[PDB]
Amino acid sequence: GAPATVTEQGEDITSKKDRGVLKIVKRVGNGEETPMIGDKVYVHYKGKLSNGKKFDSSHDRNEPFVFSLGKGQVIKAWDIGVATMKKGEIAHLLIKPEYAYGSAGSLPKIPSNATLFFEIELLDFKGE
Numbered sequence: 832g833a834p835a836t837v838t839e840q841g842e843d844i845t846s847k848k849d850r851g852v853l854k855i856v857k858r859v860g861n862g863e864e865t866p867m868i869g870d871k872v873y874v875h876y877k878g879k880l881s882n883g884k885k886f887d888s889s890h891d892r893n894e895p896f897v898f899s900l901g902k903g904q905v906i907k908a909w910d911i912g913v914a915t916m917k918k919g920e921i922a923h924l925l926i927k928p929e930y931a932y933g934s935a936g937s938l939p940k941i942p943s944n945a946t947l948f949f950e951i952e953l954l955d956f957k958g959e
């Protein structure tokens with residue numbers, strides 16, 4: 832399924848080239864701008880542990896998810912991944928624990944050493 836497709840076909844968007852954040856563009860967005868640290872960013876997302884054992888979605892809350900890029904509100908993989916996205920883009924990310932919750936995990940939702948999958952739609956972004 833989608834996690835294994837990102838393993839096989841995803842681009843490694845990490846600086847270290849350690850395959851810690853792998854990306855597929857599923858729907859192309861518009862415009863030249865991409866989100867930058869400090870921007871206020873508006874998304875919809877669907878996430879899950881890569882083995883399907885827990886799910887989460889902005890739609891569960893009936894509203895976009897909003898965060899400030901690079902402000903420590905999201906996991907490192909989102910700061911890295913969403914900064915590559917254009918307005919309107921849908922992307923898939925597959926994420927190693929080093930760019931998510933690590934060996935400590937984040938119980939009860941996130942076990943130690945968890946790999947994460949997200950589908951993210953970038954709705955909008957604004958400067959601080």
Ligand SMILES: COc1cc2cc(c1OC)OC[C@@H](C)OC/C=C/[C@H](O)[C@@H](C)OC(=O)[C@@H]1CCCCN1C(=O)[C@H]2C1CCCCC1
Pocket residue numbers: 876878879880885886887904905906909937940941947948
């Ligand atoms: C570890 O705790 C949670 C993880 C995740 C979602 C959670 C968590 O409980 C606080 O609740 C959903 C609502 C309440 O919060 C949204 C964003 C939270 C924050 O931005 C942090 C905690 O989340 C993240 O950094 C990432 C990226 C943004 C969207 C949420 N995401 C998660 O890791 C999910 C996670 C995804 C895989 C399945 C389990 C939930």
